[PDB]
Amino acid sequence: AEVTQLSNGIVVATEHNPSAHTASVGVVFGSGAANENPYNNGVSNLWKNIFLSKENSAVAAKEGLALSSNISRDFQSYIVSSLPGSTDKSLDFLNQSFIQQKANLLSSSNFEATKKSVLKQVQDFEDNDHPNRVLEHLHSTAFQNTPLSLPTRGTLESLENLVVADLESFANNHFLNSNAVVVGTGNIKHEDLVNSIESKNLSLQTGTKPVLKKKAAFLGSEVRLRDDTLPKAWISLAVEGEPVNSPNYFVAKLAAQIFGSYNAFEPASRLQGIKLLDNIQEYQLCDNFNHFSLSYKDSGLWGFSTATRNVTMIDDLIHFTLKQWNRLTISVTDTEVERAKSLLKLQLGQLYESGNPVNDANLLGAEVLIKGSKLSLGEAFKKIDAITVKDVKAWAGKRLWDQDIAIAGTGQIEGLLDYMRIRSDMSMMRW
Amino acid sequence: GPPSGKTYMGWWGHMGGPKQKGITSYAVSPYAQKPLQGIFHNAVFNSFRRFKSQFLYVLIPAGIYWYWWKNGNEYNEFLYSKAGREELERVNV
16 A cells, blocks of 8 residues: 655656565556647547557567557557566666667558457447447547547547658657657566666656647536447446546545446345335336446546337436436435445445556556646545545535536437436425 | 337437537537627617518518409409499490
């Protein structure tokens, strides 16, 4: 449970955990899809794909190393996993690919074979992964004409028109030092890694900063992707949430836990202590749903997602759910808040502490990049337990009560009523 | 309840139209839109258009009927004045 981080030339961050069996090293950049443009959208996803290409991947495999990378909105990360002993051979492969081979990975035979893969990849996504496709579109309309609206995997149109020069252009503007953090998780010590790094000098484009832009903003709107040939209806709905490093980051995350997630087929799920289940189970209004409090640097999204085959009662699904959310402003109970506290701790635990160093790396790098440090799991619990009913009520009265929303859906959505109908349910009549 | 006869209109979720696919709609909350005042400068010269295409279908039949009415009226007035008491005895009975 130690968050160690020191700066010499490069800001090095590590979180050691003795019993681990393995160790992971890599760099995480403070720039992701939210830094691209509508036309070069998909560059970051492309980088990730070449970094994992058959050529580069075969080199580290001989050495007994494994590769992993993830593209997000605010950040990007390249990671190399290894045994606790080869904690040095990872640092060689890292520098070899980001300085020496930052021109060998971009050959006219590799880039074309990779481009052909992300194209079949992103296409496959839009053709079949409906729930994620919808959540991606939710960000698209909620933050339109603003950074957060750009899909992480990029659009098929900005992708097929992307050239090697664009990769370089992006890389030379974001893969800088002042916008980077070298992460090390697994078992290796902070002082073990920091030495192998402060050994090899060379700055490589120092003093350079990435370009700036215009702040992200929420806009009440919707995008309806009707498709009557699909067998279900997938919809996502949300209000403007909380950004990371916000006084209410936790109240919000707790508020989502109150309604939580559900799966109509799993017996135990049907028994949960969520009032909403009394309303939706009578006529079986949906196969599943899940609330969330997504947070980013400039903004966030608080809402839920759901999938259903009861295409003639979608208005009741949406109506009941939004009536429950009304309660957070006027009648949420102590026991509901308490049930949430326990469950939030359990999930926040399983995330920050799993048996996989790669997840730890991403989380560590991402956090240190936005707030210059990581909040310890124990420090979180103290904040979570401190939340009162009054807090939830004040938060909801600001974020949920009579506030614009964003909607997105695909499939048999004829039954999803108009905007103003849904919008009206964000409140209740009173004397 | 008792079985219902087939119609040409259903209800939300089974309205009776053909299967839709490929069409994508977008909308913005009325709350985020410019308060009602922009219905001028941009929406003024555009207006009155939906009557410049129609007035003929209304004006001609109107004109025809107005002249027919005015003609018969002026004729009536003449017939019952002094000058027309002669023609009145001709057309009357």
